[PDB]
Amino acid sequence: SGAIYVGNYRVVNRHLATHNDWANLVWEDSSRDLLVSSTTAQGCDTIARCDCQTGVYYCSSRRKHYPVSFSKPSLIFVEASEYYPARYQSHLMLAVGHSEPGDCGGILRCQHGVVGIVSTGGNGLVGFADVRDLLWLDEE
């Protein structure tokens, strides 16, 4: 579990998005594992506008923050899971790190603010759904 709260927006893994999230759907990309919903509250999170390839992600399955090198957002193939089929996920960044299914929504972040949320995992890798190209999160 984990959500980015910026402006009047809640960002989630789409595979963990609630009936409420869908009722107030702003934008969804099945291929990015990303949903964004409208909120009534403003958010205090800031979205990194940068091309950092080093960050800190929260691993709930370790209750630890891990510094990581990560790849540039790409169209990468993702193996079978349980919350998804074996599929191609876009705007996805891989780092060598621990990621279980329940670590999804773990925030990845650099000095510039939030970079992404944990989306994929296993084979000793962690996949993050990039959100830094979504410029529209930073107004209204």
Ligand X SMILES: Oc1cnc(-c2ccccc2)nc1
> CB within 8 A of 85, min separation 6: which ones?
none
User: For residue 38, what are the CA distances in angstroms to 27, 109, 137?
Assistant: 9, 22, 11
Whether 69 contacts 53, CB under 8 Å: yes
Q: Which does 110 bind (CB under 5 to 8 A by kind): Zn ion, ligand X, none?
A: Zn ion
Whether 86 contacts 96, CB under 8 Å: no
Does 83 bind ligand X (CB under 6 A)? Our answer is no
104 is catalytic: yes
Shortest distance in whole angstroms from residue 39 CB to Zn ion = 24
Does 112 bind Zn ion (CB under 5 A)? Our answer is yes
Does 48 bind Zn ion (CB under 5 A)? Our answer is yes
Would you name the residues annotated as active-site residues? 15, 33, 104
Residues binding Zn ion (CB under 5 A): 48, 50, 52, 110, 112
Residues binding ligand X (CB under 6 A): 19, 22-23
